[model samples]
Target chain A: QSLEARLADSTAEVERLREHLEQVRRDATTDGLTNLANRKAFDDELDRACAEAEEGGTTICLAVLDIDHFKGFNDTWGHQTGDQVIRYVASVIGRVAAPPRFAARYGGAAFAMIFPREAASVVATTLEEIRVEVSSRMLKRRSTNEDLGAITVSSGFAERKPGESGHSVMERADAALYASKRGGRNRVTAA
Target chain B: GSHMQSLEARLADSTAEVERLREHLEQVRRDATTDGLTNLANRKAFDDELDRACAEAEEGGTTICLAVLDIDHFKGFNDTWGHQTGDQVIRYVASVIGRVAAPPRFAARYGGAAFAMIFPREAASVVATTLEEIRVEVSSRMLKRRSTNEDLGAITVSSGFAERKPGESGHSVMERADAALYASKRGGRNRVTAA
Candidate 1:
């Protein structure tokens, strides 16, 4: 091909590749099942939020959520059905935790939400709201049209403590999660 | 500058843009296919390959085998050792799988602690042997917690395989493989089940 023709082809190829590249980037940072941000993105956001909170003199809240009886539900209903439950919950989280607040699939049936510039009390209220919203859903089995009953979630919340690392805050949030689980599943506990 | 010189400069600018686009595209392609934790091919890549393999086999009138695998009691490990160490174990297993199922043989991380592999033009028995080999190799190794050096003990994987039938879609073969995997799970893990 002539030089100009080759250059034209090269420009078109680059344009095509650019679209594919954008899609690939989106897939990489997203969880396959839930279409939520994956763990890697969550970790990155945690670090960024921590730094931003520290530098900007704003409060940051980190929360961990678990689907109550998820393992048992999966065992009883099979994975495909389990996936439906997960996706439903994830959509709720995505709606609740929009931009400025980050939400991610922290890994299997677990979700993490980071709310920046929020007080501990505000965070707890928000977590409680999400918990209630999720619990309000009446779930069912797709195959037999059987009533699966209400699906519930337990959550733990923690604010970034002064001079604390993100890991430390995460640990605190996890401890709070255990407390929520112990306090009888389907409630939000703050640390 | 002369008119000819300016035209040449314009060409150079266009060439530079092409170069920049190529580098960005390369990075994005890698990110898309690779699992963040395991460095194995992600589910998207696996699905793409399975579709391509099914199409190729149909044209060539050859057979292919697909296997689905899951680490036994992996959730227990996650609960016991925490997610960081659990991630380590996943990476270790992915490395083992990469060794056994290298290029030409496509292997991918299908989901959380789940893996899939496609062997083109392979017999059921051959695929069974390969699955057995991977299972044994993985189970033989004793993994440890990265933080405390706690002996996490032997990790085992369960697998199931199915040979693609004539005129069958990739979805059907995948469903059979998934069923076989569940059978292995039910039959007691660390064993290979064929469908």
Candidate 2:
């Protein structure tokens, strides 16, 4: 091939790869399944949330949620069905957790949401709304005409205390999450 | 001759620039897809590999298996040992997974403290055995705090494997594998289950 032709081809290839590189950067922070911010992005966003709360004297509530009895459901129905449940739950949170309010898949069957400058009851009430909505609908399994029944999520939220680190707040929030679980599956507990 | 030498130099420079771009792109992709701590393929890479493997397996009608391994009671471990020692445990597990789930067997960090592997064209029984080996390797050695020398006790992993059925989505295949892992957790930890 001529030098000019080869150079042209190389340039085109470079352009294509550069575009793909940009695309990867966009997707790098997102979870493939739920399309929410993955754990890494969550950490980054949470740190920022903490900074905002610490510097600005605004209230930031962090809530942790886990699907109740998800293991049993996964074992009984199927993983695809389980994925459907997770997706449905995420879609619900996505509608509520718009910009300024961040939501993430904390890790398998778990989720987190950050609310800046939200009141305690308002946050708890919103989470209860989330909790109720999550269990309100009955979902059917993928490729199965069977009823998957009501899927419940247990949650705990903590409003950042004075001069608190994000990690400490999260630990408190996690304990509250377990509290919700112990108290009963579908409830939201506050720390 | 002088003109020809100049033209050759230009061509060499252009080729060299192209080579450098290729390497840089490779590095960017790697950085994007690799987990920060364990260096295993991140979730994005895992999703891509699993989808590709599923499609390829279906096209070729070959045996495809997936296994998921998770550290047992990792939350408690992290709480007890602190994040530093917890990270040490995570790195330790990833090392074992990386060794076993090497090239040809695609491995990834599924999420926090969880690892996944896609074995294309491998038998279910073989994958189970391989997962069992990985499980044993993780639990066989006791982990301790690198700095404090405190015994962190046994670090065990429960694993589950499943073969992909006809024309199933990668997500579908993953569910079964996960279910098997649940069974492993139920039937006691540090074991492998097949579905």
Candidate 3:
């Protein structure tokens, strides 16, 4: 067969394959519950970001956020209610974590953000904003009208160190998040 | 002839782009399904499997059991030792589960220090025995912080198991296992309770 003939013959097939791949790609990357990028997306992006910024041309910050007393909350209210808390947090992060700023439904109880070309100072301020907004309202039972009190998150962010790798950057972020928990919940820390 | 060569080059370029997208989709699936730390199935993956497992058992009258695990005082452990070391503990626990809760027995890092295992076509007693072995194997050795080489104490887990009852919802069974898990916690850590 002629080369052009072969290319033309595969045209519809290629177009459909591309569409199929796009659909599956979105499905695979999406967190069905939270609708944010999934953990794997978060990992891949962070590693790529770290590699690109290894020479310190741009700033890459990783922020991790976890709900306080979540297990106890789940035990008290059941997973059904626990989902509300998660969606509540996810909505805020999703709204704030727009394009170029990667956000994902990370560890089962936590969320993570990747701020490329953003300042650690600004990231902390943004995180603090989220912290305040999260705790500002009373999360009452919609059906029962029972006040479930407020939900709080302890968060931490780490600026990618000079010549740092993705794993190392994550270690710093995790340690900082733990420190926030230790110091007190409802707070944000920078590492 | 020249036009044919040009067409071939462009086609090759399109081929490469398509191949890359395909590879990216594979990565996305892997990332979506598996836990980053433990390499076990993540919560979403487990949930998807659990619902299907429940369906299979319910339809065929096969046995299916769900086990929930929580590390004893993990918050305290994480707070005191820092998350880096805390991660080591989580990884080690997950590694043990990966081995014992091997294929046909699904395992997942449900959430922070909370793991889940699903055993299909198995009785509650069978799952209980496997989980107990996992508990012992985890606590059997002392884990040292690889970075600092600091001695972290023995890590113990409390696990709860629930075999699905007739006409039971998957959500309810998970809660039962969770309740059993809390029972193990109350009965004293490092124990297993089947409901």
Candidate 4:
């Protein structure tokens, strides 16, 4: 091949490579099923939330969420259906959480969300909105688009306290969440 | 030329190996933040945020409360409905809790049937209200799985709440909530109680 032609080809190849690299980065940070902010995304946003809280002398809300009676879904519907349920729940929370605030799949049937400078009242209202919105959406239990049925969620929330570490806030939130479960299922409570 | 060709082949194999490792690493990263089954945040993620909240509470003298929840006869649910329905129940509850946890406050599945929240600038009574609202919704909704003809009634959850006290660790606060949950269960099957 001519030198000029060879050079042009190499340039085009490099450009394609760069595009591929960017796509890979995007995939790395996203949850494959729900396409929401993955754990890394949560961590990055959390750092920002902490910084904003520190600068403003305000508080951020941190929470952990678990599905109520998720195991039964799997036993009844199978794992594939269970997978869809998880993805559906994540997508609903992502819509409500929006940007600056992010939702994450913590593991299993549980997820976590972070809010910046939101007060307890606002947080409560937002969570309830999400529950209603999500419950209304239909999800497919099978691989096809046909939905086997819909799923519901129960949540917990807490505002971060000054000098209290992020971990501590979550721990309190978690405790409160369990309180909701013990009281019953499919509800929101605060710690 | 043969030796050079062999070296090129070896280099290509090395590149493939590197790609495999990268995929594995990314998978691990995904697993670290996600609930293995329900695809929610694990306890570790909750801890990270909880610690931060507590530190802030200490600085601002923010009052905090804790609650621990367990499924009412969760073992019964598992046995009767089967494990899959139980999973559905857990997922259903997570969605409810996540949506309920608004900004400035958040929720995490504490353990098993329990989820947790952190509230800022609110009294313990407010938490009680939050629980009541959620319980009301959970109780009314019906779950219908496509695979089965069986239709499940709306979810039922019980809760206990405690107001935040000065100088309380997460553990102590949790105990207070736990105590309240025990009391609540004794009182009835589905109810929210304050400790």
lDDT for each of the candidates? 0.85, 0.83, 0.85, 0.70
Per-residue lDDT, model 4, residue B120, is: 65
Q: lDDT by residue for model 1 over B1-195, one digit each (tens)?
A: 476565566667777877788898787787777777887888888899899999999999988999998999998776666655777788988988889887679999997899999998788898899888888888887777755777899999999899888979999999999999999999978899886
Going through the candidates in the order shown, the clash numbers are 0, 1, 0, 140
Candidate 1's displacement at residue B42, Å, is 1.3
Candidates ranked, most accurate by TM-score first: 1, 3, 2, 4
| Residue range A7-94, candidate 3, lDDT tens digits | 6655655686678767877876777788998877788888888888876577788999999999888898778888899999999898
Candidate 4 residue lDDT tens string, A93-179 = 877877667788764577889888777898888887867776786766455557665566777778887777665676677667667
Worst 10 residues of 1 chain B by lDDT: B1-10
For candidate 3, give the lDDT: 0.85
Mark the regions of model 2 whose C-alpha exceeds 4 Å error after superposition. A1-15, A142-144, B1-25, B43-89, B95-107, B110-137, B140-153, B158-195
Candidate 4 chain A: worst-modelled 10 consecutive residues by lDDT: A1-10
Docking outcome class, model 2: incorrect
Q: Residue A42 of model 2: what lDDT?
A: 89
User: How high is the TM-score of chain A in model 3?
Assistant: 0.89
Superior candidate under TM-score, 2 versus 4? 2
Name model 4 segments beyond 4 Å from true: A1-10, A136-150, B1-195
Question: Against the true two-chain complex, what DockQ does each candidate achieve?
Answer: 0.44, 0.18, 0.31, 0.02
Runs in model 1 deviating more than 4 A are: A1-20, A31-35, A53-59, A71-84, A137-148, A161-168, B1-5, B121-124
Candidate 3, B1-195: lDDT as tens digits = 788788898778777666776677677677657777789887788889999988888889898889999999997887677656777789989988888876788999997789999888887778879988998998999778776777788899999999888988789899999999999999988999976
Considering every candidate listed, which one attains the maximal TM-score? 1
Superposition error at B123 for model 4 (Å)? 63
**Model 1's DockQ?**
0.44
